[PDB]
Design a protein around this ligand. Sequence first.
Ligand SMILES: C=CCNc1nc(N)c(C(=O)c2cccnc2)s1
Length: 294
Amino acid sequence: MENFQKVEKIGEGTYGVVYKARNKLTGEVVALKKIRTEGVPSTAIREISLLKELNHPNIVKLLDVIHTENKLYLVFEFLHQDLKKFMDASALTGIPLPLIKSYLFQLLQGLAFCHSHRVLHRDLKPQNLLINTEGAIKLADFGLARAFGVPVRTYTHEVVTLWYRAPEILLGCKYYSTAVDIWSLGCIFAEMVTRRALFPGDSEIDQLFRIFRTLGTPDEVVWPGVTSMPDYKPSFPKWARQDFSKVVPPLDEDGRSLLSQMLHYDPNKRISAKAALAHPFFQDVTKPVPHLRL
Ligand SMILES: C=CCNc1nc(N)c(C(=O)c2cccnc2)s1
């Protein structure tokens, strides 16, 4: 980009490529995302022009949006590491509980904010959660499946991760609710605690069945209306819910209680971000500094 010196490619996002770049003029270092073509929708640039005002300490700041040459560029504040990398870097020892708790609390603050402003993330995963040396964690790469759409990959040959997808999306719900973000965050919470993905499906049905095998195949009792969902099949196997203490050992009962509420099948029973913030698990929340190697 004529106005930026791509320092390096920092990823192949779900819409385009992401580069670390320096503003040749201001000297500020940013994350530049080049969006995918033949005119670009306007309803999108509005949805985007909306996210620019969605400013919060736990939401990656969207600095500028630029539509030019069938290319759409999003300029974001740069963060040095994502949670996926940090989790991999902490796999032998694990992220200390106080830090896991701080991160979970901050992400819920970010989601409570998004949700109170009627914005859904829709694609939370460790790779889209950015952290800095001061102990903050922020939501990045908001989905925008209602502003541009959800492509088969990202833009070119790239398998989309289904591990954090809410069951209602997998069952074909046409309208997502804020609850899909709580589900994804609960999956991330579990993963930070156990150091292993909770539901690592490699296909939509395998993702769905891995969820069913752990939480039990949903029925009308725990999820009213489930058997009437678009992709629900009466032929789905009937798995019994496994004991919850076996899922995230050795997480304490306060943590397990909160997680169970973030993982309720029925989107309406699923705890809201606002309510989760008041959960007993956060009585002793603090803000530790992570050990980051950059
Ligand atoms: C994690 C280190 C790179 N630094 C980044 N810093 C930011 N701000 C990044 C993003 O806003 C982002 C992330 C994933 C997909 N699309 C955009 S990436």
